[PDB]
Amino acid sequence: PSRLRKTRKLRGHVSHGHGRIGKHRKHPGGRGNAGGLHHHRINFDKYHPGYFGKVGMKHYHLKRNQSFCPTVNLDKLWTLVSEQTRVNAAKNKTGAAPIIDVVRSGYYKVLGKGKLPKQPVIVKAKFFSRRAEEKIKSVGGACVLVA
Amino acid sequence: GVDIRHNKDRKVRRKEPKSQDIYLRLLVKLYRFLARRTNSTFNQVVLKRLFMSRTNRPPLSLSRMIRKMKLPGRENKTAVVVGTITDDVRVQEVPKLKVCALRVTSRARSRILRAGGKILTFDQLALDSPKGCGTVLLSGPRKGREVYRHFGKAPGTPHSHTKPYVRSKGRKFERARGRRASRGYKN
Amino acid sequence: APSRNGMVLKPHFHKDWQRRVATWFNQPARKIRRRKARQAKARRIAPRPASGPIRPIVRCPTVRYHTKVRAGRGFSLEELRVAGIHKKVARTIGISVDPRRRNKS
RNA sequence: CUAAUAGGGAACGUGAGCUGGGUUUAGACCGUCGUGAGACAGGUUAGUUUUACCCUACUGAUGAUGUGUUGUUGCCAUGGU
RNA sequence: GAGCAGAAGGGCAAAAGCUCGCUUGAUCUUGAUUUUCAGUACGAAUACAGACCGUGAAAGCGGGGCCUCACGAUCCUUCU
RNA sequence: AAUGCCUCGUCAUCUAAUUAGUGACGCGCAUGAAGGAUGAACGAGAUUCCCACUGUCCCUACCUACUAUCCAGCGAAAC
RNA sequence: CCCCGCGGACGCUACGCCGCGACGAGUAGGAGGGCCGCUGCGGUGAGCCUUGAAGCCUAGGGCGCGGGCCCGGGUGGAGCCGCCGCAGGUGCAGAUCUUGGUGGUAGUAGCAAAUAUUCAAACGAGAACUUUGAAGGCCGAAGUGGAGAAGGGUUCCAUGU
RNA sequence: UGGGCCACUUUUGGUAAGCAGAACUGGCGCUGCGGGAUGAACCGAACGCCGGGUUAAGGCGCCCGAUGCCGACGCUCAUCA
RNA sequence: CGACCUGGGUAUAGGGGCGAAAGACUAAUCGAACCAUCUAGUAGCUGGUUCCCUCCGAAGUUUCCCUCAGGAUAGCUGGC
RNA sequence: CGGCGACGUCGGCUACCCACCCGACCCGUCUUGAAACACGGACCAAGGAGUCUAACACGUGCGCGAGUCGGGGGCUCGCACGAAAGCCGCCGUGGCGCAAUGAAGGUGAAGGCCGGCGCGCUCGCCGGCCGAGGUGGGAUCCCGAGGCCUCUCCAGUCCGCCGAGGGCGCACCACCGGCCCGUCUCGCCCGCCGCGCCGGGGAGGUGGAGCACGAGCGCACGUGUUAGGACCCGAAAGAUGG
RNA sequence: GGGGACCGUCCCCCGACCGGCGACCGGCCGCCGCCGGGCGCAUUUCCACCGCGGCGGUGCGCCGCGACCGGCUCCGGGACG
RNA sequence: CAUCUAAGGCUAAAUACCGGCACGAGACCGAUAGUCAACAAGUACCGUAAGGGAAAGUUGAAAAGAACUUUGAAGAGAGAGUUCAAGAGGGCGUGAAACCGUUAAGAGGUAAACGGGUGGGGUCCGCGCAGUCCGCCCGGAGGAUUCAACCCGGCGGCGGGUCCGGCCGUGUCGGCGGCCCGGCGGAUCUUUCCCGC
Ligand SMILES: [Mg+2]
Ligand SMILES: [Mg+2]
Ligand SMILES: [Mg+2]
Ligand SMILES: [Mg+2]
Ligand SMILES: [Mg+2]
Ligand SMILES: [Mg+2]
Ligand SMILES: [Mg+2]
Ligand SMILES: [Mg+2]
Ligand SMILES: [Mg+2]
Ligand SMILES: [Mg+2]
Ligand SMILES: [Mg+2]
Ligand SMILES: [Mg+2]
Ligand SMILES: [Mg+2]
Ligand SMILES: [Mg+2]
Ligand SMILES: [Mg+2]
Ligand SMILES: [Mg+2]
Ligand SMILES: [Mg+2]
Ligand SMILES: [Mg+2]
Ligand SMILES: [Mg+2]
Ligand SMILES: [Mg+2]
Ligand SMILES: [Mg+2]
Ligand SMILES: [Mg+2]
Ligand SMILES: [Mg+2]
Ligand SMILES: [Mg+2]
Ligand SMILES: [Mg+2]
Ligand SMILES: [Mg+2]
Ligand SMILES: [Mg+2]
Ligand SMILES: [Mg+2]
Ligand SMILES: [Mg+2]
Ligand SMILES: [Mg+2]
Ligand SMILES: [Mg+2]
Ligand SMILES: [Mg+2]
Ligand SMILES: [Mg+2]
Ligand SMILES: [Mg+2]
Ligand SMILES: [Mg+2]
Ligand SMILES: [Mg+2]
Ligand SMILES: [Mg+2]
Ligand SMILES: [Mg+2]
Ligand SMILES: [Mg+2]
Ligand SMILES: [Mg+2]
Ligand SMILES: [Mg+2]
Ligand SMILES: [Mg+2]
Ligand SMILES: [Mg+2]
Ligand SMILES: [Mg+2]
Ligand SMILES: [Mg+2]
Ligand SMILES: [Mg+2]
Ligand SMILES: [Mg+2]
Ligand SMILES: [Mg+2]
Ligand SMILES: [Mg+2]
Ligand SMILES: [Mg+2]
Ligand SMILES: [Mg+2]
Ligand SMILES: [Mg+2]
Ligand SMILES: [Mg+2]
Ligand SMILES: [Mg+2]
Ligand SMILES: [Mg+2]
Ligand SMILES: [Mg+2]
Ligand SMILES: [Mg+2]
Ligand SMILES: [Mg+2]
Ligand SMILES: [Mg+2]
Ligand SMILES: [Mg+2]
Ligand SMILES: [Mg+2]
Ligand SMILES: [Mg+2]
Ligand SMILES: [Mg+2]
């Protein structure tokens, strides 16, 4: 809505909010990111450190599918299966542990943030972290690798 | 003439909700009367939070609510939040909670009710405790927002750990000069 | 000129973009035209499936998608050979055939 | 020569008053400087000087107000000198 | 009232000057701080901490010059 | 000297009187040889003088034509 | 246990109403409010209107701090407005602004290059200018004469206005 | 916005300047009002629309509000007061 | 009477022509014609920038910049 | 309490003209300073200048919420409206968020208390519990001795208010710890189909836009910055083809 | 692959106990009110008119006067310490 | 090790479309706008040429477009007539401002104009010109579907252990009742009865 804007309130004020001394001119200072090393250097250094220069090795023809490895933490591991899977295993008299295949749910790596409830579980994944495997074995579970 | 300054005369605060939600305005009418006609400071805090903007009323997760209600001496008390109660899927067991919230997520509401809990709106809370007795007034994390990572001292100053505004994150985006001693300086 | 904190923005509008702008006001008409052509084609092939030929089961290539299965271009010649279907009769009875796809497993 | 041939101001009075010798465009010559284009508070020659009918000022020319109309003869305020 | 390399100012006497003896702390490192300052950088400087050393009988002192000046980004190159 | 700052150079001549002209001199700021120096004829070229001639002037006057002026008709512009 | 009386003002669009206290300059600039204004769309006003819409004019009556608005009179002759939202090519004194129109100047400057006109008559409503006649003059054959090229294109010639 | 300027006082260059350059506070710029006849800055005082009272700085022959007080004490005569 | 004047027909075209030379002339245009387009070229520079009331209310200073008629930066401002 | 009232008077005036007293220089603009002998403006009418797109940032409103979003496609008499609306769910592909850090190879965020043991060696095998530590502040909330009452009292019946002190402490702030990735220094152990120039672990500093019980996503609006003709008008120029 | 069982939600029912008849509704009662029709037909009730009537409210068509009270203010007398 | 088989050829569909033919629509513009062009517009006109390029819509329902008389040489008038209207008369809907003529009123030697304060005059306005109104009471003289209380009927409002139903929320059991004789789901178990190794 153009009726809610400052231009309706600036009718009758000669400078339109841009001043009488400095006026509103075309491009004082340059166009775009002009002069980022000369007369806008303070702004670029203050808010964008690291902007200028090269760092690291360049790699031609990056295929992002090769490095596709979504990760899931331990605190969300039991959300990949139904609540019925969880409650049946908890009240199970035998030592049967459900299998959570994180690859089926769309994750490849199991990271170890958080804590697990105290009941065994078999976790299928492409990759595990050291602490994720340690906590899974702590609750009596097992880590099994898939490809 | 009087030697005074007028630049701080007008106090800047919400005197009413900027929202046009008529259900929020009705229970603002309710708690405006309660704050005026009682001596309870609980009603005054609740009323001023009803005026507040959404960023000033962050959501409260189930885990944080459970943790604050598990502190000693808070049993059988009503957890009141002026805002949304949100499910947390990182908690496995939900105790019996009595809660009053402006909004409750569908899944958080189902979990609370299965645990044997109780959910009240703010008009039911007024009937249940007009003076707000036996309540635990909680708030969500106010600074749990992405904007607060960018706030603070400028990223290009020493000892500042504030996130810069970058379109993309990678080894080519704002990592060379001013970020490592090998390229000019680090600070 | 930059002003306080901000993002270094690089718009790609230095190249007379206003002379090549694709508006989409014919999108609802294109959806109607496609829908009418689909209906007309289905009427043309009277009892035959409206979608087209049957496509094979195919695993998606990369490591991002090899857990997923979709429809391929056509049945390979080794598949038709052991199914007992001639590779020239297959297309006439609604079986799509892809002669350039092999079977690794 | 004369009594004397005092010094000055008025947008260094005065160019819709003139003139245009000088300076101060474009042509050209000489000396000096510069590799050169070119330059010279150096010299020299040739080089378009537009408009007033408006307002005021001023110069003159009719008139105007008041004595009822109209005419003759007059006075002198004031200004110049 | 001399000298301390140099401009000037400060400082300094069994010193910081002069002469000897032994040496390489003018080395390897991470942070913090001061100075200019926007409390950005560079340069310079201060106080530590961890190595490895020098010197001295030792306490200690020393990571350049008694202090205040003597210097230099991105990109590229070159060496380790 | 159309080339010399000092400079209105110095001397002579021209005049009553000449920063002008001509002749002469020359350590010449900074003349000079394919351009230097001469030399008739020529020139809407620059300069000085003399005779004659005159309203250029002393010192203005008068006359003629067309205007301006007034009238009938017509009728702008600058600003 | 009010009752010989059967009764008792207003209010509170709560985005409303009421009370008390202090305060009030403002360029550049920012913000808020606008029952200020223009145009169009969705709703709504059982809206207005040929018994007279819009527009315009008005020594008419008023309201508002103001932006502006309402009403009377006249002209006009066919459409228009209020409220809730929505959307803008949405408000002018300037820009040596653009286009159009109009003043003062001003009945002014001016209608002054190449010697020159006059008398009578006719036609005609009307004659300094037309026509005829009579004079006086000019071009003076390198013409103000008689013919062509280029260019023009019917200006040629009659008749009429 | 990133042209400032002015005044008391301190203060540098300059013979000086309504000059140029600093420090401090205030002002003008952005500010009207009473007074200084007049005036960006001085003196008083800062401002919604008004009635009454009283003042500031400044005044009270007449212009022009207010001494039209029987004001006090002296000083001073100027033919540029 | 000549290196004379002149008609018409031809030739030379824009960084080109033509010039007994003046940067002259090349259709009133010449130290680079005219026409259309790129093109609404760019402008730290000049001019303008349209209704009302209420509230708050500055700066001409710091640092850096081929910076000195401009910016970034801190300061001063307003709003939430 | 008085007077006065229809063809002459009564009241009114913002509005019309005129008179008088005081005040009063012409607006716009740049500017330290304009009435300026600074520029533009003879007059009137109509037109006339911060826009739209994209991208960010923050604020605000709305829906859902560890998710969110169908925008591309498809299905629905193909069509007045309707080019709308509705729906899809094995159309969520995908985007953004949910994980960071390193140039990369890669790695990748749980502790606290009570016990027996090697040696409770700065510590390794377990047990039991609990589930992001602690300090100082901290709205709110909870307890609360003691008071506040009636016509009066010996003696409790029910609850309301004030209340010194005490307690649990939201959000947030300061600080101290802890965890993850990079990089140093020191050091000793462990693993085994590959006994390796193999793999893992510890302590103490330090670098990170991190963790430490999520807050985001979509839509709308506002403001600011930017690229675009970019608030409007304005060069001297440059190029292409005639 | 089908068919089952189990679990989680649901949608209807067969019944009772619990809180309510509610802002989900009817029937009976009880109280109250209104309306219509009778009866009541006159010291009641109502209607309209008159008094230069009174008590209230508002307000005088225009122009004016006075009084006392209160607020603010400028003055003047008198007396006491 | 993987993957294809160059240096020959054809091929629809989905895609594009500011020219053309024919259509439909619009929160667009409304005659200085919208195309330059609403109209005899790429026209008139300009330039040697390449090229440049306008302005310009509206009587009335119907021409019923003013017969006739009269002055004038006519333009132009005065009468008359048509029309609802010519105060619509062929560039004719309305008809602003600037500017001009005339009439009326007022004024005028410090150029006008303006702010504040009054005064005078004028034009209008006021149903101005004996000045509001209405509640109760008192008195006077009059009228009347005539008042209270009762009866009949209708309709409401409020209350009632649920008086009676109908129910509503929360649980509560046989699940008789739903994988045949009720559904939808589940990353829960299974033929240990059944169609594919
Ligand atoms: Mg302003
Ligand atoms: Mg203006
Ligand atoms: Mg530079
Ligand atoms: Mg203020
Ligand atoms: Mg002079
Ligand atoms: Mg002249
Ligand atoms: Mg003159
Ligand atoms: Mg000359
Ligand atoms: Mg010359
Ligand atoms: Mg030479
Ligand atoms: Mg000549
Ligand atoms: Mg005299
Ligand atoms: Mg050391
Ligand atoms: Mg030292
Ligand atoms: Mg000479
Ligand atoms: Mg002479
Ligand atoms: Mg000589
Ligand atoms: Mg030679
Ligand atoms: Mg004030
Ligand atoms: Mg103000
Ligand atoms: Mg506009
Ligand atoms: Mg205008
Ligand atoms: Mg004349
Ligand atoms: Mg003449
Ligand atoms: Mg002759
Ligand atoms: Mg001839
Ligand atoms: Mg002829
Ligand atoms: Mg400036
Ligand atoms: Mg100064
Ligand atoms: Mg200024
Ligand atoms: Mg100020
Ligand atoms: Mg002031
Ligand atoms: Mg004054
Ligand atoms: Mg004075
Ligand atoms: Mg006063
Ligand atoms: Mg005075
Ligand atoms: Mg007086
Ligand atoms: Mg004296
Ligand atoms: Mg030349
Ligand atoms: Mg241009
Ligand atoms: Mg300027
Ligand atoms: Mg200006
Ligand atoms: Mg100036
Ligand atoms: Mg001005
Ligand atoms: Mg002046
Ligand atoms: Mg001038
Ligand atoms: Mg100017
Ligand atoms: Mg002008
Ligand atoms: Mg103009
Ligand atoms: Mg306009
Ligand atoms: Mg749709
Ligand atoms: Mg996916
Ligand atoms: Mg704490
Ligand atoms: Mg810490
Ligand atoms: Mg911003
Ligand atoms: Mg532009
Ligand atoms: Mg160039
Ligand atoms: Mg047009
Ligand atoms: Mg029109
Ligand atoms: Mg005529
Ligand atoms: Mg009419
Ligand atoms: Mg007309
Ligand atoms: Mg008139």
Side-chain angles (χ1 to χ4, degrees):
Chain A
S2 74
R3 63 192 188 273
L4 298 184
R5 295 178 189 163
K6 286 181 52 176
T7 311
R8 318 302 326 153
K9 299 285 181 79
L10 288 176
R11 286 289 188 242
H13 309 69
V14 312
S15 309
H16 213 80
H18 291 283
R20 288 172 185 274
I21 305 167
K23 307 153 178 322
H24 188 189
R25 292 274 158 88
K26 311 304 290 278
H27 293 86
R31 286 215 204 199
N33 316 121
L37 263 178
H38 298 266
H39 62 290
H40 299 150
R41 171 183 286 229
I42 300 188
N43 180 279
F44 271 79
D45 284 9
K46 183 159 183 167
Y47 297 111
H48 312 111
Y51 183 75
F52 299 98
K54 310 183 197 180
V55 163
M57 315 182 287
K58 60 193 186 195
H59 181 265
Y60 319 132
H61 192 218
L62 170 73
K63 283 164 278 192
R64 299 231 177 247
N65 283 33
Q66 294 194 289
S67 61
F68 177 80
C69 177
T71 61
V72 61
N73 285 316
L74 281 187
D75 53 12
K76 307 252 181 85
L77 180 89
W78 280 103
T79 71
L80 305 189
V81 299
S82 74
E83 187 171 324
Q84 184 192 183
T85 313
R86 151 154 192 141
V87 300
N88 280 13
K91 72 196 184 54
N92 188 8
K93 312 300 296 170
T94 79
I99 290 90
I100 305 183
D101 192 352
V102 309
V103 186
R104 165 173 178 181
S105 278
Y107 308 99
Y108 290 171
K109 182 158 209 177
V110 174
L111 299 181
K113 184 210 189 171
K115 69 171 177 63
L116 286 169
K118 300 174 187 292
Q119 46 167 339
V121 59
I122 308 176
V123 188
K124 293 174 143 269
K126 283 204 191 180
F127 312 102
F128 289 90
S129 63
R130 204 205 75 237
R131 293 159 202 78
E133 182 201 5
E134 266 150 28
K135 294 171 181 196
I136 284 158
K137 297 221 253 182
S138 280
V139 298
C143 305
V144 50
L145 296 163
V146 306
Chain B
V2 194
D3 172 58
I4 48 186
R5 265 179 88 186
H6 304 281
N7 69 313
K8 305 272 166 260
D9 283 355
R10 190 173 60 82
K11 308 192 194 273
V12 189
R13 63 212 158 162
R14 285 268 176 109
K15 279 150 279 161
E16 84 198 18
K18 188 158 268 291
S19 164
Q20 302 290 306
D21 180 18
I22 59 173
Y23 289 87
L24 177 80
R25 292 216 160 230
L26 278 180
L27 60 87
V28 162
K29 284 176 182 202
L30 164 64
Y31 265 83
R32 208 186 280 272
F33 180 68
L34 282 177
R36 179 177 92 245
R37 279 285 300 277
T38 77
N39 63 346
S40 163
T41 41
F42 172 84
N43 294 321
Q44 298 181 358
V45 181
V46 166
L47 173 66
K48 82 182 179 187
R49 287 191 179 179
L50 290 177
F51 302 159
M52 263 175 226
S53 83
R54 189 193 276 209
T55 64
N56 286 318
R57 299 179 290 103
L60 181 63
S61 70
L62 206 67
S63 51
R64 208 189 201 87
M65 180 163 72
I66 285 162
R67 207 168 43 177
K68 298 316 163 169
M69 293 307 290
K70 200 177 61 197
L71 300 179
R74 309 204 167 179
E75 63 265 5
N76 304 335
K77 284 196 193 167
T78 308
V80 181
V81 55
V82 189
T84 310
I85 282 174
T86 287
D87 186 29
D88 206 308
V89 299
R90 307 174 289 193
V91 289
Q92 320 299 332
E93 197 269 323
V94 180
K96 192 163 108 155
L97 302 167
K98 197 178 177 202
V99 295
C100 164
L102 220 59
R103 270 187 70 240
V104 184
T105 289
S106 302
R107 198 166 58 182
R109 161 183 324 258
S110 78
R111 291 191 84 193
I112 290 164
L113 292 179
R114 289 196 216 284
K118 191 161 186 58
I119 297 185
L120 317 181
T121 42
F122 264 97
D123 59 330
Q124 305 181 265
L125 176 78
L127 291 176
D128 192 71
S129 52
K131 289 194 179 178
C133 292
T135 59
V136 178
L137 184 49
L138 296 175
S139 179
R142 188 71 83 79
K143 271 191 158 88
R145 267 175 76 221
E146 178 61 27
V147 300
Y148 289 104
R149 286 169 201 252
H150 303 274
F151 297 159
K153 286 185 49 176
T157 64
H159 315 317
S160 75
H161 305 290
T162 74
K163 195 188 251 198
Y165 291 110
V166 294
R167 54 176 201 261
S168 310
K169 185 191 268 186
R171 63 101 188 164
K172 282 195 312 175
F173 303 104
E174 288 197 26
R175 291 206 200 278
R177 174 193 173 278
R179 288 285 189 187
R180 52 193 68 225
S182 66
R183 308 287 198 278
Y185 61 97
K186 172 143 168 33
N187 82 23
Chain C
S3 195
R4 286 204 197 74
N5 209 352
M7 199 176 297
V8 176
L9 306 168
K10 288 199 194 279
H12 289 53
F13 293 85
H14 299 92
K15 213 201 280 193
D16 193 355
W17 61 276
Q18 273 171 114
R19 215 178 75 215
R20 305 171 301 278
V21 172
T23 50
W24 285 57
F25 306 123
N26 67 324
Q27 158 181 54
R30 183 208 313 285
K31 285 172 78 74
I32 284 159
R33 181 187 322 124
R34 280 174 171 163
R35 190 176 131 78
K36 289 216 267 153
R38 254 189 310 272
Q39 288 165 340
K41 178 188 63 186
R43 267 180 262 119
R44 218 183 63 236
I45 44 172
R48 295 172 199 79
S51 55
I54 175 169
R55 311 274 165 178
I57 286 163
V58 155
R59 202 156 282 281
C60 305
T62 53
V63 82
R64 175 167 189 195
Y65 299 107
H66 55 56
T67 50
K68 196 217 298 209
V69 163
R70 58 160 171 89
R73 162 161 195 109
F75 292 86
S76 74
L77 295 177
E78 200 43 68
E79 287 158 2
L80 289 165
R81 252 195 288 281
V82 295
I85 299 164
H86 199 278
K87 77 175 178 192
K88 275 148 191 182
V89 181
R91 267 179 205 115
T92 77
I93 63 169
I95 304 180
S96 69
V97 49
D98 189 4
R100 72 174 70 88
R101 170 162 79 83
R102 78 272 188 186
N103 293 102
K104 288 190 58 183
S105 70

